[PDB]
Amino acid sequence: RYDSLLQALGNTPLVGLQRLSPRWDDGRDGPHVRLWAKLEDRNPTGSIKDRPAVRMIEQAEADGLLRPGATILEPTSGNTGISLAMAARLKGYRLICVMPENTSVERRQLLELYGAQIIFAVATAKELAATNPSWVMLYQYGNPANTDSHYCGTGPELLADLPEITHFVAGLGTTGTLMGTGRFLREHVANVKIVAAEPRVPELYDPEILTARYSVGAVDAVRRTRELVHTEGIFAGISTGAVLHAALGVGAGALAAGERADIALVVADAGWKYLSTGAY
Amino acid sequence: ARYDSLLQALGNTPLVGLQRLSPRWDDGDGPHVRLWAKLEDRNPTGSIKDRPAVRMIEQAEADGLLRPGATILEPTSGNTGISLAMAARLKGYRLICVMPENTSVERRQLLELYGAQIIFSAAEGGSNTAVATAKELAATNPSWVMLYQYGNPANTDSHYCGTGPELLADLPEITHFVAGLGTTGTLMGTGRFLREHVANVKIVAAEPRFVPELYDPEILTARYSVGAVDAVRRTRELVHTEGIFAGISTGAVLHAALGVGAGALAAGERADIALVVADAGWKYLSTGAYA
Ligand SMILES: O=C(Nc1ccc(Br)cc1)Nc1cccc(C(=O)O)c1
Ligand SMILES: O=C(Nc1ccc(Br)cc1)Nc1cccc(C(=O)O)c1
Numbered sequence A: 001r002y003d004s005l006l007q008a009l010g011n012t013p014l015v016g017l018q019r020l021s022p023r024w025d026d027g028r029d030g031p032h033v034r035l036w037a038k039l040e041d042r043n044p045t046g047s048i049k050d051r052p053a054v055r056m057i058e059q060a061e062a063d064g065l066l067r068p069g070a071t072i073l074e075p076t077s078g079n080t081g082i083s084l085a086m087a088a089r090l091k092g093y094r095l096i097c098v099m100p101e102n103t104s105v106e107r108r109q110l111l112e113l114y115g116a117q118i119i120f121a122v123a124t125a126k127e128l129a130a131t132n133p134s135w136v137m138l139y140q141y142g143n144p145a146n147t148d149s150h151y152c153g154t155g156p157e158l159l160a161d162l163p164e165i166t167h168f169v170a171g172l173g174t175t176g177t178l179m180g181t182g183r184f185l186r187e188h189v190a191n192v193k194i195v196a197a198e199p200r201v202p203e204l205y206d207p208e209i210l211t212a213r214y215s216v217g218a219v220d221a222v223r224r225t226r227e228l229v230h231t232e233g234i235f236a237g238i239s240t241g242a243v244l245h246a247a248l249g250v251g252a253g254a255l256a257a258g259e260r261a262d263i264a265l266v267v268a269d270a271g272w273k274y275l276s277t278g279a280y
Numbered sequence B: 001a002r003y004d005s006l007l008q009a010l011g012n013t014p015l016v017g018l019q020r021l022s023p024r025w026d027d028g029d030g031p032h033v034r035l036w037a038k039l040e041d042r043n044p045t046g047s048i049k050d051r052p053a054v055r056m057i058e059q060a061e062a063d064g065l066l067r068p069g070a071t072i073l074e075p076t077s078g079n080t081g082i083s084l085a086m087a088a089r090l091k092g093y094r095l096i097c098v099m100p101e102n103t104s105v106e107r108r109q110l111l112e113l114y115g116a117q118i119i120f121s122a123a124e125g126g127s128n129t130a131v132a133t134a135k136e137l138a139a140t141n142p143s144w145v146m147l148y149q150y151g152n153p154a155n156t157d158s159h160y161c162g163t164g165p166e167l168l169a170d171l172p173e174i175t176h177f178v179a180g181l182g183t184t185g186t187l188m189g190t191g192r193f194l195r196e197h198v199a200n201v202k203i204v205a206a207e208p209r210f211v212p213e214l215y216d217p218e219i220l221t222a223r224y225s226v227g228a229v230d231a232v233r234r235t236r237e238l239v240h241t242e243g244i245f246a247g248i249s250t251g252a253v254l255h256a257a258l259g260v261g262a263g264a265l266a267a268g269e270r271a272d273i274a275l276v277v278a279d280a281g282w283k284y285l286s287t288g289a290y291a
């Protein structure tokens, strides 16, 4: 038990996708090729972003860059702003997000609910921060604490739950998830594969880390999200579907090569905020 | 630990202290009065109903009453439908939900996504009408299996064997348990396990301003009615002060738990009060309650 919602963060579960795996059981036909989904919607605000956000705020607090009542500014497409907004409420900070306008209304309403101000993006944010040296722009595209939240949280957990791991599949945006988790995994698990999926350059990006990079179209992503919820029950956001497409490629490949695989993949958030789009 | 199936990643939900919101968080001018939030939005479909939906099916499975291909029928205000819709996809069953039209669009959406048939019963009569409609649909077509959540003891048992033990493990110093009073499973099963293990424990109900066959009034200390308006206000207050983005029934439980908390404070008595967050705010956004 916890004294704050902020502590009820991480230690997310890992779930075997038996129905969707290319081959769950070892058989006379070859070794298993299993997909394991890690449910990051199970964090305080519904997404993996609670990890880096919280750690970024705590990290600047400790660096002495924040004082109560202070204004925090972050460019975000939604999830980090929501995470940050939650944390700024409890800690007594103001939040301003710089966001693209083609975003789902659900994001707006949660930002508003948490008391965030929205300006309808990195460049914009950078300009405003230059204009207001009072403000703190944690900057998820370059803040080492993004990568650390994953090196120190996601990665270790994944290793603890899946020591037989062969591949890790995540989305590539700020790149924190793959740089943190991936470097930790490569530092502990020999010949481990680190696989991005991106839509068809931050400062956190390390080119040495990725093993693979699938580009995934929007139609494939949506299609795959639906398959996931039809077949495993998992009500995931759309990034998960791009991720899952790239997991089925690696899987198909392990199946064809008769090699054993256990393929951890990230469910970065749930479908809730994507409903308005009518992709579900 | 890991799970071979989403069906297993269920229960063992977190319990978090509400420091800002508890009347008196520090035991120092009075003993403390503490609110503890058990977060049942941490469940496969984001609701406490995962506990009972799963256990009803499995227990039906056991008793011989189900074998896939089979079609389940259930009346629901949404949460139970969703749980059952998810569990029915994995187990190879078809689902019909009877649900009133007043319900939020988000519930409809999810139900269809999981691919349940939904008969929207008329708003007039609420759940009585959703239930009566299912009984009549059951009466045509006896092959459809109605688990019946208002009377299936696998509902009360899911909380007796899960929710309760989990509470007692995390908050052994517990003095009250507050939860909404719907099918009555949560309060009956959690309340029965706790009365057995914790002497003097208070079981407190919240209900909105027919009697389910699960309902044993012996288990309850007190029934608090709560208006929608107070529920919305307390739900909003919960996010503003503790960051917890809860559903509206959680506001009603919060409103009732502060009553009890306020009671303990004013009499200088220690209270450690556990309240259920039955679901998150996601399915309530279209209502406008969060604007
Ligand atoms: O990169 C993604 N999502 C994503 C979607 C599809 C694919 Br394919 C890969 C990643 N999200 C993201 C990236 C950078 C910042 C934020 C943010 O929430 O502020 C989110
Ligand atoms: O009783 C509630 N919610 C509720 C709302 C306000 C108050 Br006060 C107490 C409970 N939900 C409920 C009850 C019975 C069945 C279902 C269902 O999801 O089918 C939901």
Ligand SMILES: *Cc1c(COP(=O)(O)O)cnc(C)c1O
Pocket (backbone or CB within 6 Å): A047, A048, A049, A079, A080, A171, A172, A173, A174, A175, A176, A177, A178, A237, A239, A240, A268, A269
């Ligand atoms: C942030 C995010 C990603 C990408 O994670 P990064 O660590 O930023 O690369 C993918 N999907 C969702 C839903 C996200 O919020």
Ligand SMILES: *Cc1c(COP(=O)(O)O)cnc(C)c1O
Pocket (backbone or CB within 6 Å): B047, B048, B049, B079, B080, B180, B181, B182, B183, B184, B185, B186, B187, B247, B249, B250, B278, B279
């Ligand atoms: C079911 C439910 C309740 C009440 O619980 P019962 O165990 O049915 O009495 C309260 N709130 C929500 C959101 C629910 O789905």
